[PDB]
Subunit: 327 residues, 4 copies
C-alpha cells in the first residue's frame, strides 16, 4: 500500500471523526504547496523571456515569487471554507476572512521563507501553523496570539533538490515527497524520530562578535571537543527550512540566537519558530530560546521575534546546561 | 529574442567554424543535465513506492540517484561521438571510448556533486570540464591530465530551488535557467562578472582545529574586522556546486583548504576544482590553492586532490596576502 | 473561487454526510487517473530507448500501457479501503477484494479504452462506474450485476489534446481539466447540459452492409435530409471515450449498434455502455439500445455486450422513432 | 544509442555540410513544438481559473490556444535567423522577416490544425513545409509559391494521447516521440514506409450528397466490396494531422475531395496539403487531387485550396482508376 498525502489526511480525519473542515484545510495547503513548488522550479519562465513575443500580459503584469506565493496561500486557504484569521509574514495586520467563507481555524504561515537564497537558487520553503479558534468572539488578531503548545498541525514544505512536505500533528511527524509527475505527495517516512545526538552544528558564525558567552562556549566545544572526539561538522544553508530539515533528518543542532541587530532574535515566533518547534518536539527533539520552551511563549504581537535553538535532545540540553551554568 | 542553450551553442559553433563535433558534445551534455534534473526532482517516484503494485523492491536493490546520474552522463556523451576519454568521480579509471564512437574531446565530470546532501534534500549539482586531445597516440588516462588552463569549456548545473546550467568558454560565462515545462535552458544572464568584493565567506568551520594559520587569521578578520566595518556573513551549504554558485552570483569567498588532517585538501582537481576555477577566472574571480593558481597545477593522478580558495578578487587577494605574510 | 476535484468531492461528501468512504474512493480514482495520463503522454520514455543504457530493469521488466493502466486502477482502488468487488475489462472474473481492505462499493471500469487508437496516438480514456453493495452476502460477482440505474457515480477520463475527467452523480455532471503542472483537476464546466439537438453523427460506416433498416434509414436522412437543411457532419474517432465526449460537449449522436460480428453489439454493458449512459442521462441526453434504455438492462454476465445509441434527446428519439416505425 | 531530434538533426547537418543555418531552423521548430505541446496539454491553466487570485479574467480577453501557437511559431522561427518569408494560416499575408533577422528559408505552417476539435479535446497538431529561396530579389509572397516538389523538409507534430514530431526530408521519414519529462524528442521509428494497402478509409461522409461519382463509387466498394472480401473500417477524427498520421502508421486512405459545394476542396495547398503529400510520398504513399500529383501543382495564392486524397499506394491507385474510368 502506497499512501498519498490526500488519502492519509482523509483517513486521519476519519479516525478523528472530524467534520471534514480540517481535512479540507489540509488538502488546500497541499494544493497551494504544489502550486508554489511549480513556480519555484521555474516552469513557464520561457514566457518571461519572450518565447512568444510579449503580448500575453497587459500594461504591467508579473509577480515576484514571494508575492505569488503569498497570493496562492491566501486564496487557496480562503477557498477551503475552513479559516477565520490568517497571519502572513507578508501582511502587517492579521487577515480576517469574510464571513461567507469563514471556518474555525487560524493559520499562521511564511509563504516563502529563505529570501536571501532566492536569487542564488538555494533551497527555500513554506512554513505553516494551525490553531482552532477558541472563543466565539468576533474573529480578530487575538486568535493568532496563542502559544505554540496549542497547535493542531504544523509543518513546512522544502523546495530543495526535490520537494518535500513535512507534517506534524498530535501523534507524530510524517514526511511526504512530491512526485511532480503526478502531483502526489507520497508518504515516505513514517513516524519520524530525530536522532538523540547529532554530529552537525548549524549557525551563522558571521555574528560571532555579538553572541552571548554560552553560544560562544558551545561553538568552541563543537570545534575543540574537551573529550577529544571528532569535531561537529558545520552546515548553514541560510534558509531556516533547509537547515531545519537537515536537522530533523540527520540530527544535530540549529541556532538563531540574540545579536545586536536582533537582541530578541531574528526569527518570527508565529510562522517561523513555533511551527518548527512543534515539528521538533513531536519528533522527540527540543526547541528552546536558551531560557524557556518556544511552544510556551504566549505571543503578544503577530510579528514577534524569538531566539531559537532546536534539534537533537542531547545537543540542545548540552547548550541549555551551558546557559544554566552561566546564569 | 529569447535565446535557448541549444541556439546559443549552435551560433557559438558557427562563429568559430567548428566541424560540429563539439556542438554535438554540448547538446549532449545539456540533454544529460535535463535527464538528471528530472530524476533528482523525484518524478515517477510514486512507482518506486508501489502505486502500480509489484511492491517487492522495498529492500532497495535498485540504483541510487548517483549511479543513475553517472550512467546518463557516460551514455549521453558516448552517443555524442565527440569524445575519446572520460574521467568520472565514480570510476576509479579513465574510460576509453570505443573506436567506432571515438571523437577528439576529453571530459572530466562529477555526475552528482553534494552526496552528503542527497538525503536531506539540499541543493546538489553536476560539474564538467572539457579538453581537447593534443596527443596523437592511443587515447589513455594521461589524456585527461591536462592543466585547467587548457580547458575549452567547463561549468555546472545546480539542482536547487530551480535548475541552472552555467557555461564558461574562452569569451566568458553565461547562465541559463531550465524551464522544465518545455525542457529548454533559457539565457538569463549574459557575460557574467563576479563583483570585486563580497560580504559572504563560506567554509566548514568544523575543521577550525585543523586550519593553517592564514585561514585562521582570515576567518578572524571576517568576524572581528580590525577596521570595525560590518562582519562578513557566513554560509555553507556543503554542496560545492551551491556554495560556488552563490559565490559567483552574490560575490564573496569559498574555501576548502588543507587541514592538518588531510594535507592536499578534499576537493578533486580534474572534475571539481579545475572546472570551478575556470568558471571563476572567466568571470573575473580568482582561484588559488593559497600558493598557486589552481588552473596551473599539472595533475599527476586523475583523482588527485587540491586545496581550493575561490571567489571575489579582493577577498581572495586579501587571503593570498595573509599566506605570504605568513611567509 | 477556483474549485479543484479534491475540494469538490470532499465538499459533496460533506453535504451528503457520507462517512468518507466514497470520498476516499473518488480521491483514489482521481490519483490513478493522473498516474495514467502521465504514462499515456510518454513521460520517461527516454529510459525505454536507452538514454542511460540498459541497467534499470532486470531480467525482463516492462509494461504495455494497457496492463500498466489496469494495475494502477486495481491497486489504487484497493488502497482506498472502499471497495468489495471490482470488474475490469481485463480480467475474466470479477476481482474480490481481501477482507482487510474491504469497503462497501463495487467498481466496474475500463482501465484504458480505445486500444485500436493506441499505436497511432489518437485519444484514448478510462471509463468507470460505481455501485453500493446491496446485500450482506459474502461479496461475489452478483454485486456487479446491477442495472445502470443503480449507479452512484460514473464517468471517464479522456486523454486527448489535454486530460479531462468527467464525473456524474445524482445531481448532474461536472467537467474537470487536469492541470499537469500541479496535478490538479480544475472544475471547468458546471452542471453540464447536452444540446437538445446536435448536427454531428458518429458511427463506423464500415459496417454499412450489416446495419439494420433503421440505422440505414437514419444515416441516409443525415446525408439527404428530407427537409433540405444542411446534412449532419460525420465524426468517428474510433475511441468511445472521445466520440462520447464530443457528443456531450458539441451535441449530436453516437452509435454502436448490432452487426454480424456482433449481433448483440460490440460495447460492454458494465464498463463501456452503462457509465456513458449514466453521464448522458444526467446531462439531459438519452441512451438506448434501439429497443430499451441501457440503464435498465439487468446484466447477467459481467462481460455482457449491448447495442448503444446516445446523445442529444431529439436526435436519439428521432432514431427510436425509426425503430418504432419499422417494428 | 538513444537518438534525440537535436542529435539527429545535427548529424544530418554535418553529413550534408550545411552552414548550420537550416539546422538552426529545425532546432527552432522543435522548440516551438514543445512549447505548443505544453500549452495544449493545459499546464498552468489553474492560473487562468483564479488559483492565485485576481479573478477578473473571467470574460476572456486573453489569447486562445491558436493565437498562442501562432505567436510561438512566428517568434521562434524569426529568432532562428534562418528565414526570410513565412506564411501562416492565421495571417492573410506573407510575413517578410526583418533584414537583420533574414535567412534564406521560406516556411509555410498551420500553427494549430484541427480547430473544430479544439473544444472537445480531440487530437490537434501543427504542420510545416520548408523551402529554399531561389529568387535573388526582395523576398515576397511569391517566394512561398513554390510547388511541393521543391520542399527541403516538411512534417507535423501531433498533440494526441502523446506528442509526436514526424519529419520528412530527401532521404525519408522518421518519427520522434516527445518525452515531456525532459523535453526531448526521441527517435522511435526510423525510415518509415507506409504499407502498400490498408483496410481503413477516412472521409467526412456528411458530404455524401456533394460527392463526385468516383468518390461515391469508391466509398461503395469500401462498404460493399464487389469481390466479397472484408469491408474497410471507417475512421474520421476530423483533425487532418490525426487522420493523416493514422494513415501513415496503419495504412489505408484519407480523403478531402471537392464536393459540389466547395469546388477546390477545403484543405490549403501550402501548409496543409503540400507538407502532407511530401511526407506521404517520402514514405511510399501517394497524394493526388484525383487528376494530378498534389506536389506538382503550381500554387497561385498562398491561401489557395486543393482537393487531396492520400495514403497507401494501392488504395489511392484504385481510386485514381475510378476517376479515369469516369473518363
Ligand atoms: N484530517 C485530520 N487529521 C488529524 N486530525 C483531525 C483531522 N480532521 C479532524 N481532526 C481532529 O478533529 C478536530 C475537529 O475537526 P473538524 O471537525 O474538521 O474541525 C480537529 O481540530 C482535529 O484535532
Ligand atoms: N559550439 C561551440 N561553441 C564554442 N566554441 C566552439 C563550438 N564549436 C567549436 N568551437 C571551437 O572550435 C573548435 C573546434 O570545433 P570542433 O571541430 O567542433 O571540435 C573547438 O575546440 C572550439 O574551440
Ligand atoms: N463525495 C461524495 N459525493 C457525492 N455523494 C456522496 C459522497 N460521499 C457520500 N455520498 C453519498 O453518501 C452515501 C454514503 O457515503 P459513504 O458513507 O462514504 O459510503 C454515498 O453512497 C453517496 O450517495
Ligand atoms: N540539419 C540538416 N538536415 C538535413 N539537411 C540539411 C541540414 N542542414 C543542411 N542541409 C542540407 O544542406 C543545405 C544547405 O544547408 P544550410 O547552409 O544550413 O542552408 C540545406 O538546404 C539542406 O539541403
Ligand atoms: O542571514 P541570517 O541573519 O543568518 O538569517 C538567515 C535566516 O533568515 C531567514 O531568511 C528569515 O526568514 C531564515 O530563513 C534564515 O534562517
Ligand atoms: O563536509 P565537508 O568536508 O565540508 O565536505 C563538503 C564538500 O564535500 C563535497 O560533497 C565533495 O564533493 C563538496 O560538494 C562539498 O564542498
Ligand atoms: O473499430 P470499431 O468496431 O468501430 O470499434 C471501435 C470501438 O471499440 C472500442 O475500442 C471497444 O472498447 C471502443 O473504444 C470504440 O468505440
Ligand atoms: O468538418 P470537415 O469539413 O470534415 O473538416 C475537417 C478538416 O478541417 C480541418 O480542421 C481544417 O484544417 C482539418 O484539420 C480537417 O481535416
Ligand atoms: Mg517569507
Ligand atoms: Mg521567513
Ligand atoms: Mg559525485
Ligand atoms: Mg563532488
Ligand atoms: Mg480497455
Ligand atoms: Mg473498452
Ligand atoms: Mg490552424
Ligand atoms: Mg488547418
Amino acid at each position: 500500500n502506497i499512501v498519498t498525502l490526500t488519502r492519509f489526511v482523509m483517513e486521519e480525519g476519519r479516525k478523528a471523526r472530524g467534520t471534514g473542515e480540517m481535512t479540507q484545510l489540509l488538502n488546500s495547503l497541499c494544493t497551494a504547496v504544489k502550486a508554489i513548488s511549480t513556480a519555484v522550479r521555474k516552469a513557464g519562465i520561457a514566457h518571461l523571456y519572450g518565447i512568444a513575443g510579449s503580448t500575453n500580459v497587459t500594461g504591467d503584469q508579473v509577480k515576484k515569487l514571494d508575492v505569488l506565493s503569498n497570493d496562492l496561500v491566501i486564496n487557496v486557504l480562503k477557498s477551503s471554507f475552513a479559516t477565520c484569521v490568517l497571519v502572513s509574514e507578508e501582511d502587517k495586520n492579521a487577515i480576517i476572512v469574510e464571513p461567507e467563507k469563514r471556518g474555525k481555524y487560524v493559520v499562521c504561515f511564511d509563504p516563502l521563507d529563505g529570501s536571501s537564497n532566492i536569487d542564488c537558487l538555494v533551497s527555500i520553503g513554506t512554513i505553516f501553523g494551525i490553531y482552532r479558534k477558541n472563543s466565539t468572539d468576533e474573529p480578530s488578531e487575538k486568535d493568532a496570539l496563542q502559544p505554540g503548545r496549542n497547535l493542531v498541525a504544523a509543518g513546512y514544505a522544502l523546495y530543495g533538490s526535490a520537494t518535500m512536505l513535512v507534517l506534524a500533528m498530535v501523534n507524530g511527524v510524517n514526511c511526504f515527497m512530491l512526485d511532480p509527475a503526478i502531483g502526489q505527495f507520497i508518504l515516505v517516512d513514517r513516524d519520524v524520530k530525530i536522532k538523540k545526538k547529532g554530529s552537525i552544528y548549524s549557525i551563522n558564525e558571521g555574528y560571532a562578535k555579538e553572541f552571548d558567552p554560552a553560544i560562544t562556549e558551545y561553538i568552541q566545544r563543537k570545534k575543540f571537543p574537551p573529550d577529544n572526539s571528532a569535531p561537529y561538522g558545520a552546515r548553514y544553508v541560510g534558509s531556516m527550512v533547509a537547515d531545519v530539515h537537515r536537522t530533523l533528518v540527520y540530527g544535530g543542532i540549529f541556532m538563531y540566537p540574540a545579536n545586536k541587530k536582533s537582541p530578541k532574535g531574528k526569527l518570527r515566533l508565529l510562522y517561523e519558530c513555533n511551527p518548527m518547534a512543534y515539528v521538533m518536539e513531536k519528533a522527540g527533539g527540543l526547541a528552546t530560546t536558551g531560557k524557556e520552551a518556544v511552544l510556551d511563549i504566549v505571543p503578544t504581537d503577530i510579528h514577534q521575534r524569538a531566539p531559537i535553538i532546536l534539534g537533537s535532545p542531547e545537543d540542545v540540553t548540552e547548550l541549555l546546561e551551558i546557559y544554566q551554568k552561566h546564569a
